C-alpha cells in the first residue's frame, strides 16, 4: 500500500544528483517524494528562502532577502527539463523589497519552464501582490496551468497571523486569476483553531469567490517557535469536509493528511482540465 521506490524515482534522483538540482522535494525532506517522483512531479523554490512576511503557520523563515536573480527562471526551466518532469510547481517567498513584489520574476519561470518544456503542466503558487492589478496581470500572462494562491486559514484566524495580509484581498486575487480564465486553486490548513463551520463557510467563500480546485489538509508544526497545533482532525473528518468541497462544485478536492501543497497536483489539475473541457462542449 504505501509507495516504495520506483524506477521513475531512481531516474529522478540519479539525474538531480549529477546536476546537483534543487527542489523542494529534497530539501524540505517530504515524504510524498517516492510517490510524486514517480509520476513524475516536482516542486521548486523561487525567490530565496528569506520572506519579507512572516505567517505563524509557515516554516519559511522572515528576514532580509538576497538581491533578484534573474537567472533564476533559465535554471528552474533547465532543472524541469533535465527531470523531464510532467508536472512542475512553482513556489517562492513575499518579496515585498522588490518593487514590484516579485512579479516578473514568477512570470519569468513559468516563462521560462513553458519555452523548453511543451509537455509540462506548469502550477504557480503566488503570494498576493497586495493584490496590486498590474502586478497580477503580469504574472497571469505567463499562463500556467494552473494558478494558486493559499489563504491557509479562515478569517478570524487569518486576521491575527498573517498580518501582512487581508483574507478578502486574498480571495481577489483568486477572482482575478478566475476572470483571467486560469485554472485557480487554494489550500485550507486545518489545526489552527478554527471550528468546523469555519472551514464550512472558508470552503463557500473561496468557491464563490471562483476558486477550482482546493486541498484541505492537517497542520504540521514546523517548530517550537511556530503556531500550536489545536486539533487533530479525524479521516472521516476529512471526508465530510471533502463530500462538502465537492457538493459546493469544486472541480478538484483532496482532503487529507497531504503534507505540502502539492501532493497530487498533477492529478488535480487533470481533473479540472478536464472538467472544463467536458463543460465547454
Ligand atoms: S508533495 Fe510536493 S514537495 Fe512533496 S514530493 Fe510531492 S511535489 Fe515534492
Ligand atoms: S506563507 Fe508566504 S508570505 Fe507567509 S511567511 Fe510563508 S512564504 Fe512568507
Do not use: E, K, N, V
Given at each position: 500500500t504505501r509507495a516504495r521506490i520506483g524506477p521513475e524515482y531512481t531516474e529522478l534522483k540519479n539525474l538531480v544528483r549529477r546536476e546537483g538540482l534543487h527542489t523542494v522535494c529534497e530539501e524540505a525532506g517530504c515524504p510524498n517524494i517516492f510517490e510524486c517522483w514517480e509520476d513524475r512531479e516536482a516542486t521548486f523554490l523561487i525567490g530565496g528562502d528569506q520572506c519579507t512576511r512572516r505567517c505563524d503557520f509557515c516554516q519559511i523563515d522572515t528576514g532580509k532577502p538576497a538581491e533578484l536573480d534573474r537567472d533564476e527562471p533559465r535554471r528552474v526551466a533547465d532543472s524541469v527539463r533535465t527531470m523531464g518532469l510532467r508536472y512542475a510547481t512553482v513556489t517562492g517567498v513575499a518579496r515585498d523589497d522588490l518593487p514590484d513584489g516579485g512579479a516578473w520574476l514568477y512570470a519569468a519561470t513559468v516563462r521560462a519552464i513553458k519555452e523548453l518544456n511543451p509537455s509540462t503542466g506548469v502550477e504557480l503558487l503566488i503570494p498576493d501582490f497586495n493584490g496590486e492589478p498590474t502586478r497580477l496581470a503580469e504574472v497571469f500572462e505567463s499562463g500556467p496551468e494552473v494558478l494558486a494562491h493559499n489563504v491557509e486559514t479562515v478569517p478570524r484566524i487569518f486576521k491575527r497571523?498573517?498580518?501582512?495580509?487581508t483574507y478578502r484581498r486574498s480571495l481577489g486575487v483568486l477572482t482575478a486569476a478566475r476572470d483571467a480564465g486560469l485554472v485557480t486553486k487554494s489550500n485550507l490548513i486545518l489545526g489552527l483553531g478554527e471550528t468546523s463551520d469555519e472551514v464550512r463557510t472558508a470552503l463557500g467563500d473561496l468557491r464563490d469567490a471562483g476558486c477550482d480546485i482546493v486541498t484541505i489538509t492537517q497542520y504540521l508544526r514546523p517548530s517550537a517557535r511556530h503556531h500550536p497545533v489545536e486539533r487533530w482532525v479525524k479521516p472521516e473528518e476529512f471526508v465530510q469536509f471533502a463530500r462538502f468541497a465537492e457538493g459546493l462544485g469544486f472541480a478538484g478536492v483532496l482532503a487529507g493528511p497531504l503534507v505540502r501543497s502539492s501532493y497530487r497536483a498533477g492529478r488535480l489539475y487533470e481533473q479540472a482540465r478536464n472538467s472544463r473541457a467536458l463543460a465547454s462542449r
Open positions: 497571523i498573517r498580518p501582512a495580509f
